[PDB]
Each structure stands twice: as structure tokens, then as C-alpha cells.
Design a protein around this ligand. Structure first.
Ligand SMILES: CC(C)(O)C(=O)OP(=O)(O)OC[C@H]1O[C@@H](n2cnc3c(N)ncnc32)[C@H](O)[C@@H]1O
Ligand SMILES: CC(C)(O)C(=O)OP(=O)(O)OC[C@H]1O[C@@H](n2cnc3c(N)ncnc32)[C@H](O)[C@@H]1O
Lengths: 475, 475
């Protein structure tokens, strides 16, 4: 194959640094014919499944139940149809019956290097020493693709706790031999201090959520600092949609005078940057197939949908020995294509990134709406204040969409008629985009809580919905 | 000398693990005759000063001004008298004139691995890749001394941001081949989730501030969880006094049913665990002289005080190439001794740890009081609620000590007379301990804000002091 350090278990050279003139960290793996890479991926898939069969009773039980033996994996079509998908609920049950890391941990307790997890039943991540190096090496490779280089100051501004996002970006920065600046997030008073550090330090790259980048520009402005004077060449994000959302990407690129990159699958899927945009293929994300095998499937049969069609990402680790995920169902919605990429990398693409989680979708008069579609339409409006909330009910069918929208400070300062003009135009814009009646209630500028993490814009409470609709009928 | 990996610049074997039966990580360095170690320390001091003279114009300028050349360093007595102390204010001025890391950085920009700093003018830490390994190796060595072993689950519960404390404990846990659990701190809702993770995971070791350990036991109790059921063998702390404070150490050891260890110098002094207690020498801290040279000096002449006398710690890095500190003044107060240690390590000891920062001390009727003396006396009382505040003024001389003290919930539930009995007894106890009049105002239980970081118990406001004294005169 000629694939750079193509081994299982993987063992990367910690001293390797690509030539300064190279666009690719691994020229072969990243640009080889897709059909040649798919031959080696299937080869690796067989190794991984044999490994999981040996060390994970969780996979041994699940596969035996669905009538699968690793020897039946003879093609990528066999993987799709014979291998059952892993659900996040299966991981919880495995961890409850086999605490703390479940019966899919594989490595002995002795090899466990880091303990992380989920929050908001939580799952524990028991990552081995070798897997941490595989994650760091994979991330340095993908960050190089974004134009991030050794010696560049990289600000990692996501919470350093159970959350894998921050740790993953730090591990990549460390291996890329960049100046890792792990400021983190989460504590009150952090954002006001961060803008001062960004003004002083002038970083080349920034990592966090797309929501935090917006909140931080407002903080920079309140602190009488200009976010374009932070010397950023790029901002790279994961955690939620935004970085491949038309109006959101444009607002962040304009506020910082830098490029925006979309990345991120799942925390269970670390190296989560396995889906990521590159400096030239800057819109959407590429599926780095030789790091993690991505399949975009029809949720009805868990089989790959054709290119140009929407489906759910199903992921398989190719370079992990601790808690390896084999066909984990994301529960997210995307669209994938297989056209020539501007960077020259021969990978499938998610041109619009990831739309959101299927469970977050709601319905108004037979029309399926994703919260990111509302966020996208509102962010493309000049008078929009940067924040909103969607008030819904899943206990009864909704006839109209209730929105609490913030106007801009200049729209508010322009008076009562100017506010009413924006409220009417916002309602109409959402209606033209979604094809459903939209009731808009204007709230005071900067009243809606901002976040340094993931934006939770849907209020699914029944009482709140009734209270709002009744108040919107009285006005 | 026979000293294990005694080299400058240092380059530790990343694969070395002490025998399972060994008490010491480095038996020679840790237990060799003190006079033999002092010969090699002086040797290293000469190497470090020669290195700083070559690569740091900050040290070149400062030393030339005070009439010092590295060749004049011929004994430990020469170091004391000829080498001028570095003040934290000198670091700020060096960083302002030579941004971002000052003229004492030494390493080229290319070698910088991590960016951290101070908060509450801030100083930036530019730590090189090699120094990070030196810090991690030094910390794994000191943590081994506390009885922490490979495979042990180590909870790091301090904010992972600019603060070096969390990063230092994590780096040590990683190198000790322990199961690093970097939960961190700082965000609302973290403590409630942490107690659940500690109940589930059952860690062998916990790192944070002594204040956070107290706050967390109250959170565990509110969450109907018993902190003794967290399976902790030890808790090791840095950041402020507490772990060598009589009543505070006893309260934490009782609440968790585990041992408490004191460690920590300064963030500028990473590896900051250079002052740390050991499993057998569990009271106070030992000065790990071959990691960082500690001198306890008279603040009047910056020369070493005899053993058994109080003074200020002055520190010198022996294993750092990036931002190396040579005779940095801590501004703290301690007492050092040179008697045989129960663990067998031949190091000077701080038997009562560090009392506090000299600038934090206040005076009432010609009597010098440290906030930790009030905290120590109150924590030794059965009716004390776990929190208090000291209300002072530095604009005018104080005749009495104003205290806002919290009673226990059981003292409150016992009625008005029981509350008045505690208030009178608290006032008398502080008076007997300090030798000054103490006015006590009781506040409602759990009203005073708790912290996951450093407790700021002194309220130095003039208006607040006058308001309180006037109210305590009316009652
Ligand atoms: C990828 C990471 C570590 O940043 C993360 O947030 O992982 P986590 O397991 O906490 O949550 C994963 C979910 O966040 C969402 N998400 C993460 N990155 C993106 C993204 N780039 N675009 C659209 N949604 C994303 C998806 O719904 C995904 O299933
Ligand atoms: C040592 C570290 C990284 O945890 C820390 O807090 O360093 P930082 O530079 O932020 O602050 C250092 C100051 O905290 C106090 N401190 C740190 N550890 C202790 C301690 N163990 N005992 C009595 N005071 C301590 C001293 O006043 C010291 O000068």
C-alpha cells in the first residue's frame, strides 16, 4: 500500500515532522486512490474485529446474537449488513453490568492512562496510554491540514474536565509541536480575562465551540477590544453545528478576520477530528477514512446511502485498542459526497457538515425542523441580536413555531416601530425558509444566556409552550 | 555521587519504574548524606548560573548590577550573599519590556510546549518540551513518596487553565503510570457531579486545594453520599495553607477516612511539589533539594536562617532550561528544621508547612496575625460551621479583630442561647490564641461562599470594617 506507519496496534514515530513545504502530514494515506485505501480499510476492519472478538465479551455477545463472526467480514458490504450497530444505550448497560468501563474496554486495567466521560446515565472513558498517542498523532495530522504549524500559538478554549473536545485539541497541539495554550472554559470571569490574553499573546489558532467564539467577540467588544486584533489565522470548532452553517460561519470569520474550520464526530470516537475540513477544502468536513471508518447509513437498515444522499454517521475505530468502537450509531444527520476535493485529499465529504441529532428534530404541521435551520435563517439577518430560543412541546402536535428572538442593540436604539419591523421580518423569513407559521416574541438585547460550551436553544417544556402561545395570542 | 540521572540539561528515562517494594523513586538522591548532596547542588548551581548568564539578558543585567559573575559562586554561602533575589515584580517588568515571556525565557521560541500563567499584571509561563518532562518526572517521584502507585485512580480536581497546580499534578500522575482522572474545577454544577464520580470510580488519591476538599464533603453530604465511601487512601494539596494546619488537616482526614499530604511552592517554581510531605514524614513538607534548591532566609539580608528559625523561602531551579528561576523570593513565611525524617529521606523539613504570604499579615494592637492562625483556632472548635471572614482595614490602626463566623447547623438548631454560647466561646478562643480582643458576629449556616480554589477570607475594605464595628457596637 505504501501507507505511512500502517500498523495494528498502531505505534507512531513521535519525532516525525512533515517537510515545511508539504500540504499533507501523510501524503500517501491522505491522497492515495480511494479504492486502494478501501482495500487496506477492509484489511484493518478484519484485524480490529478479530481483536474485539478476543478481548471484548461485549462484542463477542452482541455479534453472536446478530449471527456475526469476524471471518464473515469479506467486503465493506458484509460490514454494513452483517455487523450490528452499537448504540450509546448499549455502552451504558455494559458499564452498569461491568463497571467502570464496560466489557468493551479490551486493554488490561494497567494500560489505562486517562479517565474522561459524558455529562448532562453518564459513560466513563478509560483511554489507554497507546490510544492517547494514536489520538494525539491523528489530531496533529488533521490540524496540519488546517494550516496550523509547529511554533504556532494554539488557544484551546473548551472546558478541561470529562469533556474530550479540549483534551483532543490539546493532544494534537502538543504533537504538532505548537505552543499549546490550554486556557480552557467553564468558570465565571474567564472570558473577560481570555480576550486580554488573546490581545497580548496573538494566537494563530483557536479551538472551542462555534457558540463560544460568538460569545467571546461580544465580551471582546464589551472589554473595548477588537477581536480582529487577536492575530488569528483560523478558528477550528467541534461540539455542535455552526462551523458549516452559512450565516454562523460568515459571522465568526467576519468578527475575527480569520478562517473557520469544522471538525468533530463524537467523544466515544476520539480521535473525534476524524471528520474535519482542510485549509483548501474549507467548507464542511472530510471523512479521514484511514483514521476512523465513516459510513453514512439509512437509519432503517444501517446500510450506506449513495453519495449525494442524507443519512446517519456510523463510525469504526481503526487505530484503537482501549474501548474500540465498531459501528457506533451517532444518531446525527448529514449528507455525504465523493467528488474531487480542492486540497487534493481523496476522502468522502460532508459538504454541509452535520445538521444535528435526529432526536433534537421537532415537527410543526407535518414539517420536520432541525434547530440549526432556525439558527441558520436568523444568523443571515442583519437585525438579529445573536441569540434566540425555540419553545416547543412533544406532548401535543404543534400548529405554529414559537420563537423568542433577540434584536440587535442598534435595532432596539432605533425605537418601537424599528423593533416591530424586525419582529415581522424575522417571522416572515423563518416562514419562507421552513414553510410553517412562526410566532416571534422579541426579548431585550443580551438578555438570553450566552455559553462557552454547546448552545441548548430548544425549550421542550409543555407549560412554557402554553404560557408563551397564550401570551402571543393576547398581544 | 551515584545520583540517579544527575545531568544538566536533565533527560529522564520515560520507561523507568521503581521496584514495587521500594519506598523511594530515587533511593540515592533522596536518602544520600545531606553534605554529599550539597556538594552536587553547588556543582549544579554553577551550571545553572552559567546557563542563565549565556541565554538570559534579564539575569545578565541583574547580576552585573549587584556585582555578581557565575565564577564567584564557590560555595552555598556565596550564593546567599552575592546572588540578588528575584522578585515577582522583576518578572512582570521583564515581560512588559520583552513580551511575551520576558528576557529570562532562555530557550528559543521553537522549544515552547505549554503556555500558562497567573490571574487575580499577570505573568505568562512559557514552558519548554524538555522542562515539561522534567516537571512530570519530578512530580511522579514525589507522588510515589506519598504512597501513590501505578494503576491507582488519581482525581485531579483543580481548574485546568492558567493555573499550574492542576497541570503539575496531572503530569506527575501520567508519568507515575497511574489512572489520571482530570475532572478539574471552576464551573457551576461540577462539585455535585464530582461526588457521584468519586462514589462510582473510588479513587486512591485526590488533588486540589484544602478548601475544595472541605466544600466537596459538604456537597457529598447534601447529595446524601458519604465521603468516606469514596475509597480514598490519600488527598494531596497545594495552593494555600491548610494541609499542615492542625484543625484543618484533622477535619479533612476524618471526613474522608484518608491521609492528607501537604505540597506546593509557587507556579513560577514548577515542579512546585519540590516542597512536599511523604507517607511516613506525613506532617509538614520536605525540601527536595536536588529538584529545586530551597533556602529559608531572613527577609532583611536574604541569607539562610539557622534550623529551628522562621524565614522566607527563596527557590532555585536545578532542572529547568525554560524561564529558570534563580533565587526567586516567595514572600511567604515558614520554619525549617534538619532533624532525622521518619521516611529516611535526608532533606530539610518545613514541619508546620507554610504559614502564609507576609503581605497577607495584619496587625491588631502591636500583635502580628496571619489569617491561617484564625482559621487554625476556629477549626479546632466543635461548634464552628466550616466558614468565616476576617474584616480589616490597612488605612488605620486596628484596636480589635472583627470576625464573621458561621456556627454549625446543629448549634443553630439548638436555639438562640446555644448560638450566643458559641459566639462567646469563639471570641474567647481567638483571644486566648492571638492575645488580642476579638469581636465575633454570627452569620447563618452555609451563607458564606465556599470555593473550589483558594480561600480569600480577608475583607480589607475600610467602609466594610467601619460598618461592621459600628453594627457590633449597637448590638
Ligand atoms: C466531538 C466533540 C468531542 O467535540 C463532542 O462534542 O462530542 P460529544 O460526544 O460530547 O457529542 C457529540 C455530538 O455533538 C454533536 N457534534 C459534535 N461535533 C459536531 C459538529 N462538528 N457538527 C455538528 N454536530 C457536532 C453531534 O450531535 C455529536 O453526536
Ligand atoms: C503551588 C501552586 C501551583 O499550587 C500555587 O498555588 O502556586 P501560585 O503561584 O498560584 O501561588 C503560590 C502561593 O500560594 C501559596 N501556597 C501554595 N502552596 C502552599 C502550601 N502548600 N502551603 C501554604 N501556602 C501555599 C503561597 O503563598 C505561594 O506563594
Amino acid at each position: 500500500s505504501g501507507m505511512e506507519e500502517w500498523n495494528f496496534p498502531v505505534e507512531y514515530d513521535e519525532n516525525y515532522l512533515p517537510p515545511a513545504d508539504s500540504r499533507y502530514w501523510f501524503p500517501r494515506r491522505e491522497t492515495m486512490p480511494a479504492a486502494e485505501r478501501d482495500k487496506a480499510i477492509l484489511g484493518r476492519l478484519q484485524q480490529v474485529c478479530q481483536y474485539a472478538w478476543e478481548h471484548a465479551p461485549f462484542y463477542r455477545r452482541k455479534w453472536e446474537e446478530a449471527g456475526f463472526q469476524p471471518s464473515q467480514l469479506k467486503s465493506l458490504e458484509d460490514f454494513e449488513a452483517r455487523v450490528p450497530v452499537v448504540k450509546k444505550t448499549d455502552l451504558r448497560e455494559s458499564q452498569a453490568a461491568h463497571p467502570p468501563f464496560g466489557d468493551y474496554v479490551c486493554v488490561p486495567n494497567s494500560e489505562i492512562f486517562h479517565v474522561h466521560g459524558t455529562s448532562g446515565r453518564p459513560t466513563a472513558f478509560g483511554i489507554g496510554r497507546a490510544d492517547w498517542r494514536a489520538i494525539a498523532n491523528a489530531h496533529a495530522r488533521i490540524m496540519w491540514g488546517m494550516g496550523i504549524r509547529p511554533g504556532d500559538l494554539v488557544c484551546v478554549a473548551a472546558v478541561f474536565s470529562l469533556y474530550m473536545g479540549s483534551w483532543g485539541a490539546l493532544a494534537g497541539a502538543e504533537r504538532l509541536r505548537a505552543k499549546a495554550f490550554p486556557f480552557g472554559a467553564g468558570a465565571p470571569g474567564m472570558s473577560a480575562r481570555l480576550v486580554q490574553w488573546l490581545d497580548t499573546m496573538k494566537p494563530a489558532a483557536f479551538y472551542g465551540t462555534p457558540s463560544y467564539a460568538i460569545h467571546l467577540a461580544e465580551v471582546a467588544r464589551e472589554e473595548k477590544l477588537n477581536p480582529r486584533n487577536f492575530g488569528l489565522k483560523c478558528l477550528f470548532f467541534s461540539g455542535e453545528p455552526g462551523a458549516s452553517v452559512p450565516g454562523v460561519k460568515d459571522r465568526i470569520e467576519e468578527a475575527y478576520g480569520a478562517k473557520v474550520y469544522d471538525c468533530g464526530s463524537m467523544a466515544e470516537m476520539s480521535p473525534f477530528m476524524n471528520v474535519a475540513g482542510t485549509e483548501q477544502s474549507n467548507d464542511g468536513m472530510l471523512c479521514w477514512q484511514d483514521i476512523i471508518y465513516t459510513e453514512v447509513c439509512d437509519p432503517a437498515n444501517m446500510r450506506r446511502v449513495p453519495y449525494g444522499q442524507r443519512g446517519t454517521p456510523v463510525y469504526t475505530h481503526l487505530e484503537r485498542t482501549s474501548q474500540p468502537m465498531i459501528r457506533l450509531l451517532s444518531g446525527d444527520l448529514t449528507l455525504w459526497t465523493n467528488d474531487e476535493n480542492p486540497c487534493g485529499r481523496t476522502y468522502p465529504r460532508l459538504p454541509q457538515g452535520i445538521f444535528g441529532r435526529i432526536d433534537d428534530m421537532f415537527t410543526i404541521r407535518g414539517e420536520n425542523i432541525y434547530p440549526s435551520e432556525i439558527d441558520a435563517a436568523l444568523n443571515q439577518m442583519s437585525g438579529y441580536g445573536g441569540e434566540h430560543r425555540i419553545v416547543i412541546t412533544r406532548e401535543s402536535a404543534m400548529d405554529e413555531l414559537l420563537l423568542r428572538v433577540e434584536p440587535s442593540e442598534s435595532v432596539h436604539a432605533a425605537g418601537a416601530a424599528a423593533l416591530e419591523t424586525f419582529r415581522t421580518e424575522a417571522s416572515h423569513r423563518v416562514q419562507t425558509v421552513l414553510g410553517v407559521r412562526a410566532k416571534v416574541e422579541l426579548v431585550a438585547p443580551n438578555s438570553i444566556a450566552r455559553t462557552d460550551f454547546k448552545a441548548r436553544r430548544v425549550i421542550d417544556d409543555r407549560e412554557v409552550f402554553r404560557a408563551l402561545n397564550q401570551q402571543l395570542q393576547s398581544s
